Design a binder for this molecule. Sequence first.
Ligand code: MAN
Ligand code: CA
Length: 251
Amino acid sequence: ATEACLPAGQRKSGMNINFYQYSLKDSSTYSNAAYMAYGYASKTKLGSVGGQTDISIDYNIPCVSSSGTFPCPQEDSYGNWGCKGMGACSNSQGIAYWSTDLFGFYTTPTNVTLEMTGYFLPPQTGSYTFKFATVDDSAILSVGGATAFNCCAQQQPPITSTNFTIDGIKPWGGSLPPNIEGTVYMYAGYYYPMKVVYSNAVSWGTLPISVTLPDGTTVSDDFEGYVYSFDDDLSQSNCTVPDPSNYLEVL
Ligand SMILES: OC[C@H]1O[C@H](O)[C@@H](O)[C@@H](O)[C@@H]1O
Ligand SMILES: [Ca+2]
C-alpha cells in the first residue's frame, strides 16, 4: 500500500517548485539516482514559485536569425544550425540562456534542476498510470508518504528514497526517449504526496507529464483540481495514513 495523508491545514491549489543550480553541460550529475532523489538539495537554491498547476516543461532555446530572435522547437533545428522557417541561427546552442519560461521564474532554463512537490487528490479509487511522454534531460516522479515526502511535511528537506514511480534519462547526445509509465493504486479522497525532480543540462528542456485515471480519462499538462499544497504542520497528529484501505475512518 502507498502511504497517503490527511492534512488538516488550509489547502492551496497547485504545486510548489523549487529551483536548484545545475552546471551547464554537466553530463554526469543529471543521470545519477541519488542526485535526482535528494542530492539536488545540496546545490544552491535559486528560488521558488508556488501554486503551479500546469507542470509540463517545454523549453526551446532561441534562434537568433536575420529577422529576429525566436524560440526554435527542437524538431525544427537542423544543420549547424538553423531552424526551419527562420534560416541559419547565429547563436550557440551550448551557452546558458536566461528567461522566465519555467513558471515565470527568471533563471537559466538551459541548466537547472527543479523540484516540484504537492499532494495528488484522486477522485476515483483504482489504478492511475502516470506518464512522461519523453524526457530531456532527466526526471523522476515519486508518489507516497514513504517515497515522495512525509505527510504534513511538504517543505522539509528531501527524503532519501530512490524508489521512483517513474524515472527517465535521455542518454547524452542520444535521441529523446520513448514514453515512460508507472502505475499506482490510489484511494479516493486521500492526499498522496507527489514529487517530480527534473534536470536540464544544456539547451532544450522537455517533460510532458500526464496521468490516466482508473476510468480511462487522461489529464495532460495541467493538473488543476488534482494537485494541492499545504504548509507544513509537524504537530498534526493524525496526518499520516499508512494504509488507506484499512484506515479507521472517524467522522
Ligand atoms: O542529450 C544531451 C543533449 O542533446 C542535444 O544537444 C539536445 O537534445 C539537448 O537538449 C540535450 O541536453
Ligand atoms: Ca537538454
